[PDB]
Each structure stands twice: as structure tokens, then as C-alpha cells.
Design brief:
Elements lengths: L3 E7 L13 E6 L6 E4 L7 E9 L4 E7 L5 E7 L9 E9 L8 E13 L5 E8 L9 E5 L2 E2 L5 E2 L14 E6 L3 E2 L5 E13 L10 E8 L21
Antiparallel strand pairs: 1-2, 1-16, 2-3, 4-5, 4-15, 5-6, 7-13, 7-14, 7-16, 8-9, 8-12, 8-15, 10-13, 11-12
This protein binds a molecule of 2 linked components (MMA-MAN), calcium ion and manganese (II) ion.
A molecule of 2 linked components (MMA-MAN) binds next to loops.
């Protein structure tokens, strides 16, 4: 299977697989069953911002998700990602819907990874920023139902022409270039990601969420990973 590290914005409590009984943000290390969660107020129809931060010094993967009214949720988890991820990864966004649904609209996404080795600024770095997506976004690998639009957005999961999100959808977007996420001689290996998103649902209980994830370079949507598996995992183990 793929190796996945993810920050999930999980809109739908699947309490049978260890979700807390509320929408939550979570840090997922090789399992959809978050190692750490925090209660999250998803604001229907509002634009949220997720920030994900990690560095190999503090070895603490942190995320905050906020809305313009100042509400936010944060989760941090101490983890040495050297021992979790392969040296080379791809980074992406993933989302799903299920029996319940929501738009999983990404309005922007940025990412920075740096490897700072030994001495003065001999550093490798990758940064990308999308504040507008184009219909044919050649530097994104779109998987599943994910599309980019003339509207400038990345719709991770299916949305009708009429703007209605569809159930049973899963989609991801990975940045085209592999990322050298850590390296043995790197004194600091850090990454940061930010994305903004608009989750809107007619459903009184939207589902299923959006994740920022880091995976092996050849990561693909696992079979049967709509709904609670967020397009990240082949099962709920
Ligand atoms: C009730 O459980 C389903 O829906 C929730 C909310 O969307 C998901 O978290 C959960 O994984 C289940 O989704 C599966 O079943 C749905 C139909 O019941 C289907 O639409 C989904 O694609 C998924 O297979
Ligand atoms: Ca869930
Ligand atoms: Mn969860």
C-alpha cells in the first residue's frame, strides 16, 4: 500500500472507526485513524484556511484550520517523519464525499519544502503556490474526480454544473514534481502547506472531508477510498 501522512479536515464523524463524535481536524500517520484530533467547527459555505507545518528539528507536525470569523481548530503531533515517509514523496490534496456530500473546493494551495544540510545556505527547496487553478493545470496530477476549472478553483470532488456537490466522490491533486521531503544529511527538513477551501453542503451532515497529504511518489487513490477513507487509505485500519 501507499505510505500516507495527512492532515485531515474530517467533516463527518465515523465513530465506528475512531473518529470523535464531531467534525475534526486530525493528523493521520499511516492510518485514517488519526493519532491526534481536535474538534473542528466546519462553517458551511465559508472559505477556510488550513496551515500545516513540520520540521525535522521540533519533529512536531502541526495544523490549524481557520475561518475568517476567527474560529479555528488546531492539532499537533510529535512524530519524526524521517521514520515514516520515504525520502522522496509527492504532496497533495485529497477529498471525498460519501452517502453525504459537500463541495471540496480548493481555492488556493501553497507548499514549501526545504532541506538545509551542513553549512551556509547549501539548501534544496521547492515552493509552489496556486491562487488560481487553470482548466489544464499541467503541474498538477489530478486523480479520481478532481478537476480544475476556468473558475480558478480545484474541485477535488464532483460538483454538478448547478453547483451541487455529488456523493460517492473522491479526488486528489498532487503536485507534479516529487519532493525531497527529508534526507539523512539534512540538518533541517521542513515543510509548510497552506490551502484554502470552500466546503458547502445541502446535507445537515456534510461529508467527508479534505486532507493535505504526503505520500510515496507513485501514490494513487486506493480502491474503495471514497467516504470516510478520504481518498487516502485502502481501509480503516
Ligand atoms: C454512511 O456511511 C457512508 O457515508 C459516510 C458519509 O459520507 C462515509 O463516511 C462512509 O464511508 C460511508 O460511505 C460509503 O458508503 C456510501 C453509501 O452509503 C457511499 O456513497 C460512499 O462512496 C462510501 O462507499
Ligand atoms: Ca470521518
Ligand atoms: Mn477522522
Amino acid at each position: 500500500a501507499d505510505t500516507i501522512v495527512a492532515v485531515e479536515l474530517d467533516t463527518y464523524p465515523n465513530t465506528d472507526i475512531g473518529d470523535p463524535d464531531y467534525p475534526h481536524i486530525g493528523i493521520d500517520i499511516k492510518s485514517v485513524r488519526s493519532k491526534k484530533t481536535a474538534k473542528w467547527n466546519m462553517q458551511n459555505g465559508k472559505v477556510g484556511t488550513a496551515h500545516i507545518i513540520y520540521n525535522s528539528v521540533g519533529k512536531r507536525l502541526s495544523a490549524v484550520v481557520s475561518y475568517p470569523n476567527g474560529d479555528s481548530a488546531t492539532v499537533s503531533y510529535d512524530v519524526d517523519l524521517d521514520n515514516v515517509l520515504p525520502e522522496w514523496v509527492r504532496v497533495g490534496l485529497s477529498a471525498s464525499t460519501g452517502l453525504y456530500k459537500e463541495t471540496n473546493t480548493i481555492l488556493s494551495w501553497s507548499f514549501t519544502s526545504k532541506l538545509k544540510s551542513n553549512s551556509t545556505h547549501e539548501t534544496n527547496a521547492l515552493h509552489f503556490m496556486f491562487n488560481q487553478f487553470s482548466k489544464d493545470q499541467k503541474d498538477l496530477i489530478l486523480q479520481g474526480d478532481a478537476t480544475t476549472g476556468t473558475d480558478g478553483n480545484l474541485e477535488l470532488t464532483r460538483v454538478s454544473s448547478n453547483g451541487s456537490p455529488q456523493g460517492s466522490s473522491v479526488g486528489r491533486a498532487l503536485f507534479y514534481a516529487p519532493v525531497h521531503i527529508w534526507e539523512s544529511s539534512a540538518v533541517v527538513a521542513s515543510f509548510d502547506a497552506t490551502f484554502t477551501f470552500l466546503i458547502k453542503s445541502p446535507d445537515s451532515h456534510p461529508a467527508d472531508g479534505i486532507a493535505f497529504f504526503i505520500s510515496n511518489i507513485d501514490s494513487s487513490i486506493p480502491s474503495g477510498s471514497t467516504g470516510r477513507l478520504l481518498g487516502l487509505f485502502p481501509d480503516a485500519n
